[PDB]
Design a protein around this ligand. Sequence first.
Ligand code: SF4
Ligand code: SF4
Lengths: 62, 62
Amino acid sequence: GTNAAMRKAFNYQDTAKNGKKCSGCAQFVPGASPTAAGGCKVIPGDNQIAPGGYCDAFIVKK
Amino acid sequence: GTNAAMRKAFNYQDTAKNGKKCSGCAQFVPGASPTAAGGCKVIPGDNQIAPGGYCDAFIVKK
Ligand code: SF4
Ligand code: SF4
């Protein structure tokens, strides 16, 4: 399932934005494997977050 | 929202069981902060899973 509202609020996209992507973001909750879709701490109920996606809420992880 | 049917299936509770709680479970999908409600792989369509809750499907995260 996806959280359409939130994805739209953050202008989520399935592709990276100039090297910026979910897999390198502090909010990402990775799936069972690298290429698996995961979750996001700020997009509740969404389990279709692509590791190579991106949104306005991105924050480089440490 | 919550998924009352799935919560009932796994005997979800809002408190921990012998120290076991959602925030320490491998099926948990954390919310924005460690204390915010999150999601769970075993209770689809529920975004009100308490980090201090528990269910029979608990599995320690390693
Ligand atoms: S905040 Fe945006 S960039 Fe970061 S993991 Fe969630 S969807 Fe991806
Ligand atoms: S499986 Fe049960 S204990 Fe684990 S996160 Fe889901 S509700 Fe909580």
